[PDB]
Amino acid sequence: GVQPVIVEPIAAGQGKAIKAIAGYSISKWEASSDAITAKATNAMSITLPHELSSEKNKELKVGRVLLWLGLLPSVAGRIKACVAEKQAQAEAAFQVALAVADSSKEVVAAMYTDAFRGATLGDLLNLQIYLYASEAVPAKAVVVHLEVEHVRPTFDDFFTPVYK
Amino acid sequence: AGVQPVIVEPIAAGQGKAIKAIAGYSISKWEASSDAITAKATNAMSITLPHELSSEKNKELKVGRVLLWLGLLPSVAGRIKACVAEKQAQAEAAFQVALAVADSSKEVVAAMYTDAFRGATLGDLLNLQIYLYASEAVPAKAVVVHLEVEHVRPTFDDFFTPV
Amino acid sequence: AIKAIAGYSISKWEASSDAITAKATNAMSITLPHELSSEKNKELKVGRVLLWLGLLPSVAGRIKACVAEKQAQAEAAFQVALAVADSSKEVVAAMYTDAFRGATLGDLLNLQIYLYASEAVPAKAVVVHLEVEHVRPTFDDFFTPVYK
Amino acid sequence: AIKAIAGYSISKWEASSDAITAKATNAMSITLPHELSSEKNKELKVGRVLLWLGLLPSVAGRIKACVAEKQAQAEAAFQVALAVADSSKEVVAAMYTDAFRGATLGDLLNLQIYLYASEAVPAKAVVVHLEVEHVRPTFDDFFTPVYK
Amino acid sequence: AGVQPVIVEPIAAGQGKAIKAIAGYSISKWEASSDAITAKATNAMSITLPHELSSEKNKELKVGRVLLWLGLLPSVAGRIKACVAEKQAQAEAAFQVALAVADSSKEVVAAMYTDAFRGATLGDLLNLQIYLYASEAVPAKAVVVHLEVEHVRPTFDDFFTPV
Amino acid sequence: GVQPVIVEPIAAGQGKAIKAIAGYSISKWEASSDAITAKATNAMSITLPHELSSEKNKELKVGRVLLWLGLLPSVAGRIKACVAEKQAQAEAAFQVALAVADSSKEVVAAMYTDAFRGATLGDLLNLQIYLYASEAVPAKAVVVHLEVEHVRPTFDDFFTPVYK
Amino acid sequence: AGVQPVIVEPIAAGQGKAIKAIAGYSISKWEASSDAITAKATNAMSITLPHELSSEKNKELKVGRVLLWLGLLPSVAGRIKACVAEKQAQAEAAFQVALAVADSSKEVVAAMYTDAFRGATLGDLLNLQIYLYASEAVPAKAVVVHLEVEHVRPTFDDFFTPV
Amino acid sequence: AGVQPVIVEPIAAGQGKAIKAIAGYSISKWEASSDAITAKATNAMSITLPHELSSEKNKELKVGRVLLWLGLLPSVAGRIKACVAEKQAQAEAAFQVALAVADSSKEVVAAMYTDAFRGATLGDLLNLQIYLYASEAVPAKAVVVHLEVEHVRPTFDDFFTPV
């Protein structure tokens, strides 16, 4: 038997949300870019937030990583980005990356389901963000957002003992 | 498993499901008109509550989902973008952090904010703004911005004013 | 206070006044809010109607107001109206318990508001408040479909 | 008399008046008592509000008072207030049954009291009494801990 | 019996039990400011009821426990004493017969009168006084005296004034 | 019968830790001071962190508040602090505060079990921190730490939807 | 039958199922770099086994599926094609008989050979070649060719070298 | 409840409970000597692992509780403070953020870090430092700093070196 179906159009920001696995939490932080010359690639380092920068918190395992970039409404051209290891040549990172966020798509994002799974929060300081631009753009024209899924920090529900 | 045959039935404008407000909530709708826009420029306009919800009794109600959709003149040529975000120092920077953008070059010109403002109050919507971008120069009164906000149903409004 | 009948709601709005010459009466039309101006909404039944008016504290003299059908002689409306809001007594209000219970929202466009003053009164000195009870609209708990 | 709803209490205080010029209106702010001025107490819900005022027996002329949101034009408040306490009729009082039922005690700082007189009136001639019903505070049946 | 080992847990300011009023009673609190004090001298100041308890209806309620505690400016140097007693011909003699004295050189600057005034009326507290002593000269508005009095809960105060 | 007991001495930082109530979480942040003249009081405002500064997050209720101050090892004199409402005269805040942290005690801390209970995170911007100094001290000589117990932020375990 | 409504959920790069090797098989991956290409010309490059599979013991294992996918520099402009086929006298003729072509103008730049080489040996992959075509002139080291080959899992490799 | 009478038994030095390491953990102890200290000055000295725990195999073990206690010469006069904290730009600033301070003017000259470093590795203790303060000028070799660290018990240390 044949089955007739109707495909219902969907609006922006109306799709489902991915939920973190049990025992895990999601921390979100964002960094800004700088000036890019036409047909060039820049390297951006990754810096942890202040509360996750302690020796105790740098041994939390990592799960999934999501990379989406927000850009100005008047940016003309194509923008691509990826997260990979540190490389001597910047533009060669796109030849080995398992996911690239491209601005000429419907969904400008990249998902790393198992590329970094099993690493620790201290390992993230060894990676970089590579950013290509088809045309010259000024500084702060693109903002990169990063979501890292990691194990829940054990001590957040306790007051500090008062006898210092 | 075997291959299952499927027929896709085309639909016209105005067909599709309509989202229903959750229990105990109501939906209030109002619209705002825009001003003259310079090309590659962005205008910021404040959200203004309707008169029937601007009292102190009503500005303490919770907020659920917010829907933004905008209707243009048929002769309008170019590209339009719009979003609802916090009050920003830079008008064009709000597109870099917004969770949804209504774009006129797509099939559905709308934007839905499912969880961004869930739990705020109706009085907090006065702290937000609407940012509207145009790629080409646009005259005034050419764009109308529609807002659907669902909120807790007010409790004392089916009473006459005692005299 | 008085509560709405089950399945009914109350709508409230107001209309500003114009200048009045001494011992003269004005004829004002009733304009619905934009939300209730659709064709499907003009068919809703009407229950009770309350008319009260608030003045500037410096207004001197007696003011009267009533709502009735369109009259050829403007001052003749105060002779047939079932309630008149007079500003020289305890309650400046007019309650219409049965005068319109059964009409539709479209019929209110056939009525008019008559205002009277015994001394010259500036513009916007009087604000006429109108509270109409009607049937709750059938579709106000849905978002507009996104695909238009 | 009218009794408070279960779980609710009534707070009463007053504010003295200033000098009024003829056909002029004053703008007064609402100041809470010191006991209800804490942050945890500004979050209590508000029920009914009653405003009545007592005058010196030698005061001549008509006096009016109302409470509403801050207005740019001071005299325009008497056009939108849901109740006005007029001193030329049987009951010099104003009852707000639903106008504020649902707000918080902190919202009363956003309202104001407007007073009107038709002749020059000295200072302290009018005393405005304000009785606000609110939710009973959660901790008023305990002594303060001695170890501070 | 064997020796039982015990650990003592230190506590900071603001920790500890709070005493609850007995059934049918309520607690009302008010404060009074002090005047300039000469060294080795004592000032007597009358107890003044708050406006909400000074009517004839309310001045007939019973009294339970009374708590006195006083808060000083941080820069205040010296020693302060205070007590609540009957109206005395000699100001400094009231310390010889008082059942409790609030002293600023101790860890808890407070005084509790559990049974001294139990059974009196709120109107009788106007016959009493507060005696305040200072070892060194003290300027005005440097000491604030707080009074917690528990009494029978008034019966007709949740009613509006009939109009 | 009489009971003999032994009181065991306890070392620094060895007492029990207070646990947050169900559904609540604890956020910790600290601010530094400035120069103080001998026998004077300063007023310090309270600023929320970035993640709790959104319109959605300013309606979370507050539970307990803990105030402890850390000071340099060479600070000589007495330091007192309190958290109260905004006042016209700064030194008058100590006459009405329900807890004062004093440096001449064994435990330099203050606990507000019910003073602020029931308020919202948006109310904290109306309070201040008052700080007295017996002797003149230079700037940054004392650090105030603040712990606020509030309702758990609802959305932290969800990835942002990818269809922007 | 009635019409069934369906919502399509968009997905981003890196989302989707990953194909699992069959039982008793393992997947080994290696890559090769390309040379300078003239426009409308085709280059032929030999398949070279990694060092860990080039012994006589390992060159006798069976082969299953082979996956070809290639990654380009972001600035590379033009069109690229690639395929794995038998050793051909004419370089460009291998596209006329190949069962799959990886094309850079499509959404998925990859090619899968499910049954073409099923049953061959690892040593037979040295008889095959890779043919790479470019519509425009391309410099060297601009294209990297990745090969995933699944094969029977070697039996004696978890042993140390006896000494 | 009735009043219960209690006798307090005094204890001498060396009496009291000894804390036992949790299951699967072991406690390793070592000491460090100090240098000359100027009055109102602070010295920073690095934590150095003993030789038996400085291998790569052992620097991957978890950490539990850390105990700091320091022993002075009998003739040492003044006041001493010490703490273990992260590596700080300002030496004296580490006392403003430390969770425990060992002070020589108290009955117990020690400091316990129950949860500050729980979950770190033995190799991370090399990133930390010890800050030591003296109110009066102190000569060298006058203070000895003792460290008790509990960690996971190593798995391969009861074996001889194979030869």
- Cβ(A100)–Cβ(A80) below 8 Å: yes
- Cβ(F37)–Cβ(F94) below 8 Å: no
Experimental method: cryo-EM
Cα C40 to the center of its chain, rounded Å: 21
Looking at residue H9, what DSSP letter applies? P
- Cβ(H134)–Cβ(H41) below 8 Å: yes
Beta-sheet strand order (sheet of C111-117): C24-29, C111-117, C63-69, C85-86
Q: Does F46 touch chain D (CB under 8 A)?
A: no
Q: Which two tokens stand for residue H93?
A: 């600033």
Nearest to D75 among C1, C56, C127 (CB): C56
Q: Does E29 touch chain D (CB under 8 A)?
A: yes
Nearest to F111 among E8, E12, E74 (CB): E12
Nearest to B124 among F55, F155, F161 (CB): F55
Q: Does A2 touch chain B (CB under 8 A)?
A: yes
Chain A residues inside the 8 Å CB shell of C147: 8-9
- Which C positions 108-127 lie with beta carbon below 8 A of chain B? none
Those residues whose C-beta lies under 8 Å from the C-beta of residue B148, and which sit 6 or more positions away, are B27, B28, B29, B66, B67, B69, C143, C144
Closest residue in H to A54 (Cα–Cα): H86
Q: Does C145 touch chain B (CB under 8 A)?
A: yes
Neighbours of B46 (CB within 10 A): 12
**What SS3 state is found at G140?**
coil
Residue type at position B89: A
Chains adjacent to H (≥3 CB pairs closer than 8 angstroms) = A, F
DSSP lists the bridge partners of residue F149 as F26
Q: For chain A, where are the alpha helices, taking DSSP H only? A: none
Q: Does F37 touch chain B (CB under 8 A)?
A: no
Q: Does B14 touch chain A (CB under 8 A)?
A: no
Q: Does D79 touch chain B (CB under 8 A)?
A: no
CA F36/CA F144 separation, integer angstroms:
15
Classify the phi-psi angles of G16: left when phi > 0, otherwise alpha if psi is within -120 to 50, otherwise beta.
left
Chains adjacent to G (≥3 CB pairs closer than 8 angstroms) = A, F
For residue F104, CA distances in Å to A112, C96, F143, H102 come to 55, 76, 16, 17
Closest residue in D to B161 (Cα–Cα): D82
Across the interface, do G10 and A39 touch by the CB < 8 Å criterion?
A: no
Q: Which two tokens stand for residue B3?
A: 């291959």
Nearest to C56 among D79, D81, D97 (CB): D79
Looking at residue F110, what DSSP letter applies? E
Residue type at position H160: F
Element (H, E) at E79: none
- Report residue H87: phi and psi, to 5°: -75, 115
Chain F residues inside the 8 Å CB shell of B119: 56, 59, 154
Across the interface, do A6 and G6 touch by the CB < 8 Å criterion?
A: yes
Across the interface, do B6 and A5 touch by the CB < 8 Å criterion?
A: yes
Those residues whose C-beta lies under 8 Å from the C-beta of residue D67, and which sit 6 or more positions away, are D30, D49, D51, D81, D94, D96, D111, D112, D113, D114
Neighbours of G36 (CB within 10 A): 13
Q: For chain E, where are the alpha helices, taking DSSP H only? A: none
Across the interface, do C54 and D25 touch by the CB < 8 Å criterion?
A: no
Q: After which residues is chain C broken (C to N over 2.5 A)?
A: none
Burial of A110 (0-12, 13-18, 19+ CB in 10 A): buried
Residue type at position G148: E
- Cβ(A13)–Cβ(B112) below 8 Å: yes
Q: Which two tokens stand for residue A75?
A: 């940016």
Chain E nearest C-alpha distance from D72 (Å):
32
Across the interface, do F119 and D37 touch by the CB < 8 Å criterion?
A: no
- Cβ(F163)–Cβ(A15) below 8 Å: yes
Residue type at position E141: K
Cα A17 to the center of its chain, rounded Å: 16
DSSP lists the bridge partners of residue B37 as B138
Neighbours of F46 (CB within 10 A): 16
Nearest to F15 among A28, A111, A161 (CB): A161
Chain H residues inside the 8 Å CB shell of F138: none
Q: Are strands A24-32 and B25-33 parallel, antiparallel or unpaired?
A: unpaired
Going through chain C in order, the beta strands assigned E by DSSP cover 8-16, 24-29, 46-55, 63-69, 85-86, 93-96, 111-117, 126-135
Best mutation target among A72, A108, A145 (most B Cβ atoms within 10 Å) is A72
CA B12/CA C147 separation, integer angstroms:
9
Nearest to B119 among F56, F158, F160 (CB): F56
Q: Token match 């002779």: residue?
A: C79
Give the resolution in Å: 3.2
- Which D positions 47-66 lie with beta carbon below 8 A of chain B? none
Chain A residues inside the 8 Å CB shell of G31: 96
Burial of D114 (0-12, 13-18, 19+ CB in 10 A): buried
- Nearest residue to D74 via CA among D110, D128, D129, D112: D112
CA H87/CA H129 separation, integer angstroms:
6
Chain H residues inside the 8 Å CB shell of F143: 96-97
- Cβ(D127)–Cβ(D12) below 8 Å: no
Closest residue in A to C147 (Cα–Cα): A9
DSSP G45-75: EE----GGG-STTGGG-BEEEEEEEEEE-TT
Chain D nearest C-alpha distance from B155 (Å):
9
Going through E50-101 in order, the beta strands assigned E by DSSP cover 63-72, 80-85
Those residues whose C-beta lies under 8 Å from the C-beta of residue G159, and which sit 6 or more positions away, are none
Q: Which two tokens stand for residue B124?
A: 């907090």
Chain C residues inside the 8 Å CB shell of B146: 144
CA C98/CA C46 separation, integer angstroms:
10
Q: Does E12 touch chain A (CB under 8 A)?
A: yes
Chain F nearest C-alpha distance from A109 (Å):
7
CA B146/CA E93 separation, integer angstroms:
80
Chain E nearest C-alpha distance from D73 (Å):
31
Chain H residues inside the 8 Å CB shell of F2: 5-7
Q: Does B75 touch chain D (CB under 8 A)?
A: no
CA H34/CA H45 separation, integer angstroms:
8
Classify the phi-psi angles of H27: left when phi > 0, otherwise alpha if psi is within -120 to 50, otherwise beta.
beta
Across the interface, do H100 and A164 touch by the CB < 8 Å criterion?
A: yes
**What SS3 state is found at C47?**
strand
Nearest-5° Cα angle at G55, G54 to G60: 90
Element (H, E) at A88: none
Q: Does A159 touch chain E (CB under 8 A)?
A: no
Classify the phi-psi angles of G82: left when phi > 0, otherwise alpha if psi is within -120 to 50, otherwise beta.
beta
Beta-sheet strand order (sheet of D46-55): D8-16, D126-135, D46-55, D93-96
Q: Are strands A109-112 and A62-71 parallel, antiparallel or unpaired?
A: antiparallel
CA E129/CA E88 separation, integer angstroms:
9
CA G144/CA C22 separation, integer angstroms:
95
CA A96/CA G72 separation, integer angstroms:
9
CA A90/CA A105 separation, integer angstroms:
23
Burial of H130 (0-12, 13-18, 19+ CB in 10 A): buried
Q: Does D79 touch chain C (CB under 8 A)?
A: yes
DSSP F69-101: EEE-TT--S-EEEEEEE--SSSGGGGGT-S--E
CA B41/CA B134 separation, integer angstroms:
6
Those residues whose C-beta lies under 8 Å from the C-beta of residue D32, and which sit 6 or more positions away, are D105, D108, D109
CA B6/CA B4 separation, integer angstroms:
7
CA E107/CA E105 separation, integer angstroms:
7
Q: How far apart are the first and last CA of chain C?
A: 43
**What SS3 state is found at B95?**
helix
Element (H, E) at G150: strand G143-152
CA D37/CA D30 separation, integer angstroms:
12
CA C50/CA E35 separation, integer angstroms:
61
Residue type at position B102: A
Chain D residues inside the 8 Å CB shell of C57: 25, 64, 75, 78, 116
Across the interface, do H96 and F2 touch by the CB < 8 Å criterion?
A: no
Classify the phi-psi angles of E71: left when phi > 0, otherwise alpha if psi is within -120 to 50, otherwise beta.
beta
Best mutation target among F95, F100, F105, F130 (most E Cβ atoms within 10 Å) is F95
- Cβ(G25)–Cβ(G153) below 8 Å: yes
Chain A nearest C-alpha distance from B123 (Å):
24
DSSP lists the bridge partners of residue E28 as E149
CA B88/CA B97 separation, integer angstroms:
10
Cα H40 to the center of its chain, rounded Å: 22
- Cβ(F122)–Cβ(F59) below 8 Å: yes
- Cβ(B63)–Cβ(A41) below 8 Å: no
**What SS3 state is found at E93?**
helix
Those residues whose C-beta lies under 8 Å from the C-beta of residue G110, and which sit 6 or more positions away, are G67, G68, G69, G70, G102
Those residues whose C-beta lies under 8 Å from the C-beta of residue E137, and which sit 6 or more positions away, are E37, E38, E39
- Nearest residue to B15 via CA among F145, F122, C148: C148
Chain C nearest C-alpha distance from D85 (Å):
11
Best mutation target among D63, D75, D79 (most C Cβ atoms within 10 Å) is D79
